[PDB]
Each structure stands twice: as structure tokens, then as C-alpha cells.
Amino acid sequence: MKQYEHVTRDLNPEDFWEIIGELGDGAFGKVYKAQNKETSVLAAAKVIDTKSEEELEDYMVEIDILASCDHPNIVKLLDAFYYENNLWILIEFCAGGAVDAVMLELERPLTESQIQVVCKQTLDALNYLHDNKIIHRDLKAGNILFTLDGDIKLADFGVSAKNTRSFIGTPYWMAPEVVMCETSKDRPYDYKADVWSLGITLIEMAEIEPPHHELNPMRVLLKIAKSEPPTLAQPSRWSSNFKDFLKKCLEKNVDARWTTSQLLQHPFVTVDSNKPIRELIAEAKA
């Protein structure tokens, strides 16, 4: 009975959106390519089997995050429906596809000039999220999408979190940070997990695969905990700016690891043209 701001109930999503293809699979099942029947707008459509009202509430976090964000490098919510025990999420379509799929299709990594554009725009998106106390929690090249104009959008907020999400009592003993709602979850610490993932994603774009890709996943967790942070395999092929930006992300001491606000001041992401990505997608169309 709970009325959700952005979710229609009891209407058939396919009366409005026509499935015209498949975009891939994932933890939440198959993701379709859909087309609005009236406007012809394209969309990625998540279709999530949800049996109970409790499951619906859990999946709603992604919808409320997408609905609340308004940033050019973050995919927008187009529609959402709950119908025949499925939650449909209609999300802005990016026709350039995911960055990891591009590297696999071309069988080569991105160049540094291309990485620099992706890094700047992804950082812009991450900084907006952190400013709004959102943690993406699944950053990787597979969750960065190319537009046909040569920009990127950050996608798949399926495990993202609003990190800060009745009587008061006598207040005389409350700490100032309690009164001011500056809890540990309001501080930079937790959001910096995304900064680490950015650094791994940069190596992934530089080398097609992330560090430790050859290891069993359980062994990868041990390596992450125990090893020094990863570096580029062929460091002499890459600029000191790129390697330095990575060092500020791939820093195991969380307090020393840079915030997105600090990274935005770094010379690696002083760049004002997306032309390397326009070139990447222009040759791919040939």
C-alpha cells in the first residue's frame, strides 16, 4: 500500500515501453533495451523479480538515488513500475556502451589521453555523489558508459547507498557532533572507498584487466588486504601525472587517501576537451 514517489503501481510497463533488445545480464537479472512507445526515447530497463513488499523497499534505494541525482555524468531515472511481481527501472540509455566492453571489442586498452577524459568526468560524477552523501560502491569500467557525443555517464547504482540513511530525550549530555548530526558516516572516510575503486578502474582502463585478475576471487581479497597497493605494470609508458594521481587514490591509509575534492585539483584531470573519446567512438563506427 506504500505509495512511492517515482514508482507506478498496477500499470503494465510494456504499455509504455517496448523491449527492443537486450543489453546484458547481471546480479539483478537481464537488462533490456527499451523504447518509449510515444516518445521513442531509449532506455535501459532493469526488470527485478520482487515477491514481497519488503524486497520492493530494498530495491527502492537505487530508484531514490537515481531520482535525486541531477548531474550530466550520472544516468537519470526515466520511469519505474511495479507490476506482476517485477520492479521495472527505466534508466537513461548511453548508446556508446560500457567502457570495458569497448576495450574487449577493440582488444586493446584506452590510451592515456582517453583515460584522462574518463577520469575527469567520472571524478566529476563521484564528487557530486559524495557531496550528496551517496557512495556508488561498485565503480569499475563496466559501470562507466560512453555517450555518442564522447562523454561518459556513471551507471548501475544497484548497490549504492545514501550513507547517512522518535523521542529526543533530555539533551544536556549530548556531544556537539551528535547535535549537529556529524556522525562517522557523514565524514569523508567511507566515501573514500569509491576513490580507491576509481584508482583500480584507471589501471583497468590502462591494462584492460584490473590488478589481480589472474587470481581466484578469494585470493584476491587476501591480496588486497595484505599487499602494497597496485601500480601500472609498464610505468614508463605513462606520465608522472597519471602515476601520481593513482598514488593518491591507491593509498591504503584512508586518512591519507585523497577526497574527490582534492583529486579535482590534481594536474592529471586538468582537461577541457573530450576529443580523445570522440575520436575513440568515431573510428569505431567506421
Ligand X SMILES: COc1ccccc1C1=C(Nc2nc3ccccc3s2)C(=O)NC1=O
Binding site: which residues? 23-31, 46
We find the least distance from the C-beta atom of residue 65 to ligand X, in angstroms, to be 12
Window 37 to 66, contacts with ligand X (CB under 6 A): 44, 46
Q: Are 104 and 208 in contact (CB under 8 A)?
A: yes
We find the least distance from the C-beta atom of residue 132 to ligand X, in angstroms, to be 19
Cα distance between residue 130 and residue 160, in whole Å: 11
Cα distance between residue 231 and residue 136, in whole Å: 23
Cα distance between residue 142 and residue 154, in whole Å: 10
> Residues 63, 74, 87, 91: which binds ligand X (CB under 6 A)?
91
Nearer to ligand X, 44 or 118 (CB): 44
Q: Identify the CA nearest to 258 among candidates 245, 267, 248.
A: 248
Q: Are 249 and 258 in contact (CB under 8 A)?
A: yes
Per DSSP, the three-state class of 82 is strand
Residue 75 engages ligand X in binding (rule: CB under 6 A): yes
**Among all residues, which ones are annotated catalytic?**
138
Sequence ranges of the binding site for ATP? 23-31, 46
Nearer to ligand X, 97 or 229 (CB): 97
Q: Which residues are CB-neighbours of 199 under 8 A, at least 6 positions away?
A: 229, 246, 249, 250
We find the least distance from the C-beta atom of residue 46 to ligand X, in angstroms, to be 6
> Residues 65, 78, 94, 117: which binds ligand X (CB under 6 A)?
94
Q: Identify the CA nearest to 75 among candidates 42, 35, 27, 38.
A: 42
Window 119 to 148, contacts with ligand X (CB under 6 A): 142-143, 145
We find the least distance from the C-beta atom of residue 98 to ligand X, in angstroms, to be 4
Count of residues that interact with ligand X, criterion CB under 6 A: 19
Site of interaction with ligand X (CB under 6 A) = 23-26, 31, 44, 46, 75, 91-94, 97-98, 142-143, 145, 155-156
